[PDB]
Subunit: 296 residues, 3 copies
């Protein structure tokens, strides 16, 4: 038995097919079994329509034996494109082994495993081509466009393995595939899923800034496009056509790194923001607000 | 010598360049030597123009030593995109070793080998990403569009390895490359080529149905678009806007699986066809006819 | 540590980030350290704008420790898409080990290594899919379009590894990545860089011909589109609508092979050019001129 053949066959019982059907449409994707009680992690674009219109869509989970069981949505994070599902009282579940994406290195052999019984299902191979790479993700329906600090791989990520696990050579999950390929690291997926299960959703920081990427010799980075009224940036001194070069303890190369850096902040604790303003380097003190105040 | 380098160098003398030239055009592709008498298997799109207009095209086979010899067309199956060529009295031929595609598993390392002396020739590497996957194939000229139950690979299939062999790690042919990559399994290629050699062509079943894929909660599958007059479906009870969910002993997910399922039937023996008709599940009894009555 | 992980980590200190910034633009690419004195090889499209407008662009080299040092351009060959840069008095430089691309074989495992600290940086994996393959390359700004005799790989070549090294499994440089992937062989890169360092630039042969690819049964190859006045081809007998099938000791399949074959000639020594003229095979005697007479 082949070396990748062995790894894929060992995690096949942990990958599931996720279908949501209405009377006129039907979405399919992949998911991962991460808890013996029935908690299944997929990405947010696979389920987006079934959450914006749950009155008309029905989500089901198909296992690798063919069993189809009802599934309910625990929570979903469009800003990390993640989601947690729940199947009830299904026995003999083959839970996936969750690894440490902090120990993942560039050039490591990986497998992007999709659900075997899916329609356009795929299992692709490659290596890790980049770590902590911000990639912009387009929201499905009414869902917002986001940027995630991602693992990059030259294994192909497509409709057939989206939501499925990125697997290392010890058959451990190191990421969630989001459909030149990108995956959500498992350590962030663990933090997000632990909150989606407990609280039904997750709360992220906000400053009220929109940015556009700038690249020149004066100041390259994220150029502020709009500052919301009453926002922490407005009450921190951030002006428009300012070039943010660092949010907190992270340098900012463009707007994509800016989104990830803001979301690596602490809600309600002052943080430093460097800005190049008309050639004058100005550091500012901004107190991040929560994107959801009542859930916080 | 590298691990893939060894496998590719062992099958290079079995892959050939296939050129067909007129006074205004010229096609090139790849082929595989599968019989010591000179029988060469390629795909149907490589030779299509030389068969629809043989009065004006001339097909030649170039070996990996550089020898160019005349070649004649034994038969061609546009419905499986396969073809058999014949070189005469060429000695010391390095025949390829044909494997068993039924023993191919997902994650198996593969090589998509093109003819070395070709123009845009390529030898690509990857894994098997799916098995028994129906993929639609567009016909070249007057040739019909078809769907094949294929092996999927993340090795790149392109003009440089089309018609060439998909090779396992024992240097055995497990498929024919058809130009996110797809190959025709070797076990089907053996059945098709054995008939193209003996009979000059092959006969497949037909029911006289055209379908369109449907995806919803009532009935997903192949929705009948047109039923031909006097057809086995017409004389079996199949109506239009019916949703076929199973042809014979194969479930049907869409129109692509429907084409492959009809062609897995027995000509002239009654077979069951499930249909969801206005919400009523109706199984029907259809007797497949041959697509070519006189050759049958 | 993984097998590719080990190779990539051993050459990471030899790959550098190359940035050129003006007041309105900024280009980034990758480069390779090939000489302890500070000589850095990248490709020509990475630096093209900083050489056509050096009054307004500033080129810098960022190492894998993060050090940013000034960099100056020694020479650039748009016809091979190569360039040599120079950093001054930088100590403890981790020079790359240059291999022999003549010993590279098809199916050999390779790594297309980009600069780790780059923005869209990538390290991709694949195999050598073709050797001595002419590929056309589009010039960046005012730079001319060229064709290079290249190494082809199914490792992805992109903005994140362009200019970086193609690395074998002994962690040796066998090519320079030029952004279904192509690389400039290391043996040609050694000849070109040795002249760009000594002489500031390189001189290539010219015949004064433009060609278009032709493919039929009479004569396939490079069809002459225009012959310059006073050119070696004009004074050799080459006429328009002639089909060149061989330049010197190299057969010519199309215009792309023609460009590489002319550049494999000797300036000022008579050479044979076969042509199929109105069905008559005519060999001609052409004396290649230098593309730059004073530098020659």
């Amino acid at each position: 038995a082949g070396r990748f053949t062995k790894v894929a066959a060992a995690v096949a019982d942990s990958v599931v097919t996720i279908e949501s059907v209405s009377d006129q449409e039907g979405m399919q994707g992949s998911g991962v079994i991460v808890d013996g009680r029935g908690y299944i992690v997929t990405n947010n674009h696979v389920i987006s329509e079934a959450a914006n219109n749950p009155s008309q869509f029905k989500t089901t989970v198909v296992f690798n034996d063919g069993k189809e069981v009802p599934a309910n949505l625990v929570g979903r994070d469009p800003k990390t494109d993640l989601a947690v599902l729940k199947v009830d009282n299904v026995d003999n579940l083959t839970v996936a082994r969750l690894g440490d994406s902090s120990k993942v290195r560039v050039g490591d052999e990986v497998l992007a495993v999709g659900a075997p019984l899916g329609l356009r299902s795929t299992v692709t191979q490659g290596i890790v081509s980049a770590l902590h790479r911000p990639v912009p993700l387009s929201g499905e329906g009414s869902d917002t466009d986001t940027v995630i600090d991602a693992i990059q791989t030259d294994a192909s990520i497509n409709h057939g393995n989206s939501g499925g696990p990125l697997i290392d050579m010890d058959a451990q999950v190191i990421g969630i595939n989001t459909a030149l390929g990108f995956a959500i690291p498992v350590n962030e997926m663990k933090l997000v899923a632990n909150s989606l299960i407990k609280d039904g959703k997750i709360v992220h920081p906000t400053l009220g800034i929109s940015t556009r990427s700038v690249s020149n010799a004066i100041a390259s980075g994220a150029q502020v496009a709009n500052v919301k009224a009453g926002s922490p940036a407005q009450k921190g001194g951030i002006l428009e056509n300012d070039v943010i070069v660092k949010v907190g303890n992270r340098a900012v190369a463009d707007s994509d790194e800016f989104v990830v850096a803001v979301r690596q902040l602490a809600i309600g604790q002052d943080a430093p923001i460097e800005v190049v303003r008309e050639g004058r380097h100005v550091t500012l003190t901004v107190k991040p607000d929560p994107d959801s105040t009542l859930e916080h």
